[PDB]
Amino acid sequence: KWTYFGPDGENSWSKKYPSCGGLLQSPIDLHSDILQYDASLTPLEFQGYNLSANKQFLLTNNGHSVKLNLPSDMHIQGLQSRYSATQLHLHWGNPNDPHGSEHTVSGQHFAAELHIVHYNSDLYPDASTASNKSEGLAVLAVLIEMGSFNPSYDKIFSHLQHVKYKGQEAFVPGFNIEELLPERTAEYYRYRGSLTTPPCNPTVLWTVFRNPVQISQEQLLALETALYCTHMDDPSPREMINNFRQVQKFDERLVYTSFS
Amino acid sequence: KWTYFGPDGENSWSKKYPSCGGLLQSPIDLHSDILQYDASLTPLEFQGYNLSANKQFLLTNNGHSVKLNLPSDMHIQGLQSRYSATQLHLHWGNPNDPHGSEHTVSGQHFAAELHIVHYNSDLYPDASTASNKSEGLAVLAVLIEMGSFNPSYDKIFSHLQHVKYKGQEAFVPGFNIEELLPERTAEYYRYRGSLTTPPCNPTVLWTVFRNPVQISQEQLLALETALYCTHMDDPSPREMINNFRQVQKFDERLVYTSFS
């Protein structure tokens, strides 16, 4: 058990989850001095992203974020192994401070952040088994900026009202998960890092897209007001807000870019 | 034992230093939405900061920073108690990434940060005894950027050669310590926080001057490269770099400004 605020917050994670106080932690601040162009970084292909709108996918409040379960037929080609999808989820701030991206760019938070989590299906049978193992995970990160209404993101946000409390679950119709990605997915940052949550294992190949996507003010307000970290019956209910980790020391890492 | 790197890093400080996971942690990002002008914040007076050049003061490498011992006769006038000087020390980054201030303005790191540590000499005999007590400590924080050669900061940096390693000590003719302060010291940020180092006690009244000082690219490089955090005959030397804490979450609070 852990939170983003007070005694159980991120400065205390390492007391229960030692990897949280180890090396190669995420997120990080993307800034010119630590960037390095790499000709190796070829375009990813997103296979099986186009989920049938006549099929149903489990959305869950896990007490930390809202998660959408993804089928393992969904995958990434282009890395050293096949990375199969396990779930996507978000990180955001609060109505009075809508700047809850995990990754920052030249010291600036975006409004929110989407993480599409994949596991090494060539090595491991699921994300859970893969999470504490070498080369176990790969995440696509989309930075989210406040702008126009996003009908694609709304295929998640219109469902939040059925997963208000921890452990609540709701079937959501499939849609093309590629619609959540920004323009020019060929332009990305790539670095070796960790889960941004406990148990913080340094097993994550990070891809952060260069370009953000936009969702409206009304979409962020809904995301920032709809969810609780706590069970429906908890007498000390806590709002699910500011569910982002502070950026971490580089530990001599560089971030490789597909662009110069 | 505590460091800015590896398993004994800042995410692990809370294990042996509980306060590092507690309330009112420094440093923080100073940005517009958390600033509030308070017309009641008048100028500090720096008394006995003009040290005899015929008096000598101990410079030490403690393996966390380089520290100049200061005489208690020097103090700040303007607060509700007299705060007497104990030491000044610095925080910096590394030559590939020369952005190692502790406090940030609008998410931006300055090259470095000087701290002049004072203690409540009306209530407490010493900084050690004051450190974990109400209204114990007051720091003057100076943000340092690349710029023109600074003769006054060179009165310190000219002696780094003699304190290369953990343990080494050296003497510095006195100079006017007010010479290390920027222009318009009437302009400052003010907030209650913590030591940025273990034991992280929430006992510090922070005064961060609005205006940075400038040191030359060569002065900054000397600081970043002159010192080690290991003993002169450690087999495995460690360069003393990136000796700054990551900014902390600053939830539902204000930094007050002396400036509109």
Ligand SMILES: CCCCNC(=O)c1cc(S(N)(=O)=O)c(Cl)cc1SCCc1ccccc1
């Ligand atoms: C186990 C509950 C903690 C909540 N975190 C995640 O679901 C999560 C977050 C990330 S992140 N924010 O770095 O993108 C990642 Cl990369 C993976 C997971 S969960 C999948 C791995 C796992 C499964 C089961 C137990 C432990 C880990």
Ligand SMILES: CCCCNC(=O)c1cc(S(N)(=O)=O)c(Cl)cc1SCCc1ccccc1
């Ligand atoms: C034994 C302490 C280890 C190193 N830290 C400092 O000297 C230090 C740093 C700051 S900061 N970076 O917040 O300006 C401050 Cl406010 C005070 C001290 S040391 C003075 C207080 C103290 C002395 C002895 C034991 C504990 C605290």
Ligand SMILES: [Zn+2]
């Ligand atoms: Zn995440």
Ligand SMILES: [Zn+2]
């Ligand atoms: Zn300091």
